Amino acid sequence: VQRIYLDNNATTRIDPKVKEIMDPFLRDHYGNPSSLHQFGTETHPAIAEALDKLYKGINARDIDDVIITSCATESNNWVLKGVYFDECLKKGKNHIVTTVAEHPAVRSTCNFLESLGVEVTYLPINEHGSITAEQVREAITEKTALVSVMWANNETGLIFPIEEIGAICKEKGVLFHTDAVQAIGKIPVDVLKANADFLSFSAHKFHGPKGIGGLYIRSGVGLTPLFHGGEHMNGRRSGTLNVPYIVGMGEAMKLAVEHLDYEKEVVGKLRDKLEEALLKIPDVMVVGDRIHRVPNTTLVSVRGIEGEAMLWDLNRSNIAASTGTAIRLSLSRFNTEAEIDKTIEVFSQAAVRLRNISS
Amino acid sequence: VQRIYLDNNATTRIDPKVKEIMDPFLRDHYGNPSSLHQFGTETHPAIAEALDKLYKGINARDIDDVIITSCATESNNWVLKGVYFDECLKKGKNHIVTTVAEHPAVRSTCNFLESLGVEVTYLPINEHGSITAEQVREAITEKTALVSVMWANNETGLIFPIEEIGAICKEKGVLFHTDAVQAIGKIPVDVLKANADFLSFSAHKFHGPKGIGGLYIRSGVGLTPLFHGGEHMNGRRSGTLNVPYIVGMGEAMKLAVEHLDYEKEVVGKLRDKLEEALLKIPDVMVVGDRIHRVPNTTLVSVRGIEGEAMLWDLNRSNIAASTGTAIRLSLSRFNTEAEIDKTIEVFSQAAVRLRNISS
Ligand SMILES: Cc1ncc(COP(=O)(O)O)c(CNc2co[nH]c2=O)c1O
Ligand SMILES: Cc1ncc(COP(=O)(O)O)c(CNc2co[nH]c2=O)c1O
Ligand SMILES: [Cl-]
Ligand SMILES: [Cl-]
């Protein structure tokens, strides 16, 4: 059998180099980095190299933190509940601006903050599937504690104007957080350009293991820990380090940014090839503005055949995709031209077959 | 070189079987268990087998949850901040009883809860290094939201009277949590016998990978999520599943409980052998009641030579241990009689050498 995987927004394959690099820390380098003895101190260099890779990936500076979390959900929960106690309660700034497009980690958390009597403005999506810089400026009260806008959307692949929203936040004196989960490895990410105070990411979206992520925290910005216990991560996030996944995620970031031109040049092209071809088969419109997107994602619709049906079919013929209904096909650098061609074929045949049962 | 590792309370070696079982999920079974397509659904059986192993390890029932967390720190933080909102605030039960002996994940969290105006009673340690059932009963007000007592202590290896504290909590109508991190794999753990509502554990203490743990939650007990986003873990703890570490931790628990008689019979004996022998070298008393302890841990003192000095020495001769000052030597099933003998030798020679520089 030979399966085609087009579900990169759900999760990605761990890069083989990433599997290789982690392996020694699952075998004989099993010491707790906190121990003083050799089993501990021996892990120190690989961890430092990892952190370094993470800093360079997002343009963090020495004076910033990139804190290791267990996933972007942790990161996101952490930013929101941290600001809740540091701003919303202790400083009266009882308002948070976000968008409707946000991942549930952000949205549900906000929902919880609402239940305690935080006022949350969920900026509405426009016709383009976007949010504009002016939209958040027009929403900032001076009780606004935080603006949280996702860098790129995982439904459509839509990029939002982070840089611009950054500027507004700087001018207005408001904490800015960007969930960048869907941007790492897909387009360049720059916390300096973004004037982010907080950035979250998750490794499994860029060929690292599931079960680890990061939160960038700008110099001098405070954020009450979500994991108290104050050992690890200059006391900001406690718990014995996930040594293998750290070493791994590090490598994952490095490879991810090394592939940034491949992503735009080749992956993007494969995505255009797929999209263009899908657009033929009679009555198939694409969803969203097709300019401001990460290179890897396309969301096609099939006229009067719910997505689920197309996908269940595609699954049977060994092509994995998901909805966003519409059909979300999302690529990685591990897709090939052959696989796309095949997808065009099997997609169209599937379309055909389902039209005919519809009669 | 041939190193001896006696720092099992810091962390343990991933069991080779555990490394084997996780491996396929780092290689080709990389699908998100939430996907509907084959890459997702194919992970379903291994995950179910894992969870099953976890349930049986602690005697959880079908009607309970064993929720997968990123570590015991997550678990502990989760219980405390969960009860804070569900009991302390929403129900006025503004008091928590714990002990002084607790791991910092519990203690620091409590410290934070104090800062919001929760009243926390930190039960004092006695001469035995213990806490008695009566001590917590005498502390329960009817504003008490939660009792949190650690099952076994990682400093001395001291077991606390969980079963008894359980009974008191049941009688008194109070939520009971036990951090069992230092008990899994060391003595039998039984949430039913314990009348725990909440139990935490962490895999790296029983030959699983760092970076994953569990919280047992009793049937019908509520606990507001620490990770909102409400996808995974019947919405109790959100974030893409750490598939490999889950499969791994599962195996780790199984092997851990399979070795329960080996642990008491052989590991315990090795520990007694080591202890007895150390007790000779002139002026070396052991620390704590030497009856109510997990089999693997001994905490010896050397008269007027701070622990750190003994350890730095021991490190040079390739024996890894830590303080608790006193010297904490903690064993696993991977220690051998040879290694202990060697330790007796090198320990005593080290004692000798440091006496003579002391002059
Ligand atoms: C933009 C974004 N934010 C946060 C997360 C959560 O990261 P995690 O904590 O590692 O799970 C994801 C991935 N989540 C999903 C992508 O597709 N379905 C999902 O549930 C994401 O795409
Ligand atoms: C009793 C207990 N509770 C909680 C933890 C925290 O588990 P983690 O979240 O997986 O780190 C540990 C391990 N911690 C340590 C054992 O020795 N030094 C330690 O810091 C522990 O022994
Ligand atoms: Cl918090
Ligand atoms: Cl919470």
CA-based R_g, chain A, Å: 21
Q: State both tokens at B50.
A: 């894992």
Task: State the angle between helix axes of B337-358 and B307-316 in degrees (0 to 180), rounded to the nearest 10.
Answer: 120
Question: Cβ B73–A227 below 8 Å, yes or no?
Answer: yes
- Which experimental technique did the depositors report for determining this structure? X-ray
CA B163, CA B94: separation in Å to the nearest integer? 25
- Give Cβ neighbours of residue A157 (< 8 Å, ≥ 6 apart): A9, A182, A288, A293, A294, A295, A296, A297, A298, A299, A330
Instruction: Give the torsion sign (CA, A290, A296, A300, A306).
Output: negative
Assign domain A15-259 to a CATH class. Answer: alpha beta
Taking CB atoms and an 8 Å cutoff, what residues of chain B touch A7? Answer: 31-32, 35, 37, 39
Cβ neighbours of residue A296 closer than 8 Å, sequence gap 6 or more: A8, A9, A157, A186, A263, A267, A268, A271, A330, A331, A332
Q: Report which residue type is found at A244.
A: P
**What is the DSSP secondary structure assignment for residue B261, as one 8-state letter?**
H
Residue labelled with tokens 């000798």:
B352
DSSP A39-84: HHHTTHHHHHHHHHHHHHHHT--TTSEEEEES-HHHHHHHHHHHHI
The type of residue at B80 is: L
What's the CA gap between B183 and A278, in Å, rounded?
58
At what angle are helices A307-316 and A337-358 packed, to 10 degrees?
A: 120
Q: Do B226 and A228 touch (CB under 8 A)?
A: no
What are residue A216's DSSP bridge partners? Answer: A66, A199
The answer to the question of whether A130 is labelled as a binding residue is no
Give residue for tokens 């841990």. B297
A132 in reach of chain B (CB within 8 A): no
The residue behind tokens 């195996």 is B251
| The token pair that represents A75 in the structure block | 């990161």
Amino acid in position B162: I
Across the interface, whether the CB atoms of B31 and A12 are under 8 A apart is answered no
Cα B70 from Cα B150, distance rounded (Å): 19
CA distance B181 to B201: 4
DSSP string, A234-285: TTTS-S---HHHHHHHHHHHHHHHHTHHHIIIIIHHHHHHHHHHHHHSSS--
Interatomic CA distance for residues A252 and A18, integer angstroms: 6
Exposure string (b/e) for B150-163, b if CB count within 10 Å is 16 or more?
A: bbbbbbbbbbbbbe
A200 CA to centre of ligand 2 in angstroms = 25
**Pairing state between β B175-179 and B144-148:** parallel
Contacts of B307 in chain A (CB under 8 A): none
Q: Which residues hold their Cβ within 5 A of ligand 3, which is an ion?
A: A 81, 226
- A142: number of Cβ within 10 Å: 10
Is B336 in CB contact (< 8 Å) with chain A? no
**Domain ranges for chain B:** 1-14+260-350, 15-259
Tokens of A73: 């959900």
- What letters, b where the CB count within 10 A reaches 16 and e where it falls short, cover A340-359? bebbbebbbebbeebbeeee
SS3 state of residue A341? helix
Structural gaps in chain A: residues followed by a C–N separation over 2.5 Å: 324
A152 lines ligand 1 (CB under 6 A): no
Q: How far apart are CA A226 and CA A345, in angstroms?
A: 49
Q: What is the token pair recorded at A236? A: 């900001």
| Contact (CB, 8 A) for B127 and A253 | no
- Kindly determine whether residue A322 and residue B227, on different chains, have CB atoms separated by under 8 Å: no
The resolution in Å comes to 2.6
Residue linked to tokens 């982010």: A196
The distance of Cα A74 from the centroid of its chain, to the nearest Å, equals 13
Which among B39, B72, B76 is the nearest to A320, CB-wise? B39
The DSSP string of B184-201 is TTTS---HHHHT-SEEEE
What DSSP string runs through A164-176? HHHHHHHHTT-EE
Angle between helices B268-280 and B337-358 (to 10 degrees): 30
